[PDB]
């Protein structure tokens, strides 16, 4: 058995840990706020109706 066969090649990924996601989390919170506004607008439209006219 004399062919050179390579068994354990190192991977592409680096050894470091996961970079933090604070800026991504902030932008996601911005999207959440935008999405909450579009439902809050409808419910607010509901809030401004007259009192006893059912």
């Amino acid at each position: 058995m004399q062919p050179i066969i390579l068994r354990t090649l190192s991977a592409r990924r680096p050894v470091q840990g996961r970079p933090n996601l604070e800026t991504y989390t902030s932008e996601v919170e911005r999207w959440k706020a935008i999405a909450q506004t579009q439902y809050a607008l409808e419910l607010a439209k509901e809030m401004s109706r007259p009192a006893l006219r059912t």
Binding site: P50, A51, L52, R53
Partner: protein, 162 residues
């Protein structure tokens, strides 16, 4: 309820007094107007539906928003309740005019009415306007003296609501 005679009787009963000259004068004042009150009540009863129709027309002409959507007289049920309320007001005003005393208006009509209208969303000022419309139509129908007499009880109703 209490009429003019029972009102005087009560004022003398709380004092334990027999009738004096002034009491007999008040009783004569009430007895002297009895034929006028009876004729007025008969005339009002004969034409009550006409009075209600004319006064409701006046009220809704002066306030068209009442019967359009969003108004408190917009549905067949709320319109019916409104004209029924006006019919009650006319009838009990006739009762009080015949009794010569506003006690029945307190006892059966005004006690709890403002709270009721607040709890239902009934506009008070519009109801007062409808009462004034009935005042005008009724006076035109019953003539000068009977109109001055029914005015007292219409104004008592309006003041109780206002």
């Amino acid at each position: 309820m209490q009429d003019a005679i029972t009102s005087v009787i009560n004022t003398y009963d709380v004092q334990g007094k027999y009738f004096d000259t002034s009491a007999f004068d008040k009783l004569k004042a009430y007895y002297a107007t009895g034929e006028l009150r009876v004729r007025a009540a008969g005339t009002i009863s004969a034409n009550a539906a006409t009075i209600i129709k004319e006064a409701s027309a006046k009220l809704f002409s002066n306030q068209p928003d009442l019967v359009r959507p969003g108004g408190n007289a917009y549905t067949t049920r709320r319109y019916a309740a409104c004209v029924r309320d006006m019919d009650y007001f006319l009838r009990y005003a006739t009762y009080a005019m015949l009794a010569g005393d506003t006690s029945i208006l307190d006892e059966r009509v005004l006690n709890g009415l403002k709270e009721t209208y607040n709890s239902l969303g009934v506009p008070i000022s519009s109801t007062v306007q409808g009462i004034q419309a009935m005042k005008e139509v009724t006076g035109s129908l019953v003539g000068s003296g009977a109109a001055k007499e029914m005015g007292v009880y219409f104004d008592y109703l309006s003041s109780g609501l206002s």
